[PDB]
Amino acid sequence: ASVQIVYKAEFXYK
Amino acid sequence: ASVQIVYKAEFXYK
User: Across the beta sheet with B3-7, what order do the strands follow?
Assistant: First the structure.
């Protein structure tokens, strides 16, 4: 598992 | 389409 951060505007482990 | 930036560690319009 790892931290995932997304910027798409919208901005959020698996 | 829009700008997409991902942090997952690695760090990249679709």
Answer: A11-13, A3-7, B3-7, B11-13
For B1-14, the three-class secondary structure string (H helix, E strand, C coil) is: CCEEEEECCCEEEC
Residues facing B7 on adjacent strands: A5, B11
- Rounded to an integer, what distance in angstroms lies between the CA atom of residue A3 and that of residue B1? 25
Residues facing residue A13 across a β-bridge? A3
- For residue B2, which residues of chain A lie inside 8 Å, CB to CB? 8-9
Token readout for B8 is: 């997952």
